[PDB]
Write a protein that binds this ligand. Sequence first.
Ligand SMILES: O=C(O)C(=O)Nc1sc2c(c1C(=O)O)CCNC2
Length: 297
Amino acid sequence: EMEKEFEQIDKSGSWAAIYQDIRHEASDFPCRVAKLPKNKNRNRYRDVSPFDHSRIKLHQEDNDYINASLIKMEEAQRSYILTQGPLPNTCGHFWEMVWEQKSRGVVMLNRVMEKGSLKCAQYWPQKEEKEMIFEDTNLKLTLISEDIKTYYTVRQLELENLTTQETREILHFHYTTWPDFGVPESPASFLNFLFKVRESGSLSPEHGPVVVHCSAGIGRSGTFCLADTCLLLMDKRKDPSSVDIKKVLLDMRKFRMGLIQTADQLRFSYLAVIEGAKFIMGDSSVQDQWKELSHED
Ligand SMILES: O=C(O)C(=O)Nc1sc2c(c1C(=O)O)CCNC2
């Protein structure tokens, strides 16, 4: 059981060793496209790059590079795209990828400003009447509506391909109280937000992969995706003891580096999956309890 393991870990105080053990074993694949000179201004952090094998390519002939990867979880049957916070020159490339990849949802786990720095571009419109036009990739993006809770906001955005005039509805789920290099305030408020995303349909396999990002696309995003996948794996089998969280994380780290950036975020994932297991295993009433606990209103 993950729960007995949690207890050993905690008792022996060795979250840091455990986490280091994962970092040591994580895969190392080339990121030669990321490191081409021409892409330097497409990467927010010099030490966070997409592997070549899993990177998302833009369907453009000029330069197909974006800092983004496809995390394809075979067994679980779920994929995600993990990407950094768009830069002021790659917001057009971001929405290009959303369009071409056919995603329905975008999960934003950071604020634009954190720890006194600009962690991400303001890449979506904040009022209905001031849409965004991304001229390099020839897309218009409009705020259609927004559901502001205390700790997250859900926006419906309309993405127009200005060439064909085709239009798509994207949902944006903005978690605003999860600190960089930090954890959510409680398992309940994170699980409540995760289940908002699920219930919206955006993780349905009839859509392209959901796009998940934080500032670097690895720490907060890794934590979110690990919890989601572990819960889905246990759902498929109705067998919580078959799920091995660290092994799930190593498999995700085959497709992007650095997933989960600190030992406490690893700790947090166990908490989130252990609590989430209650819902998976047939008490849906816990979902209402999460909602109340997270004071969403
Ligand atoms: O946004 C996150 O959750 C995350 O992984 N952020 C990261 S991972 C990372 C950095 C940051 C950052 O935001 O400064 C700075 C460069 N080193 C690795």
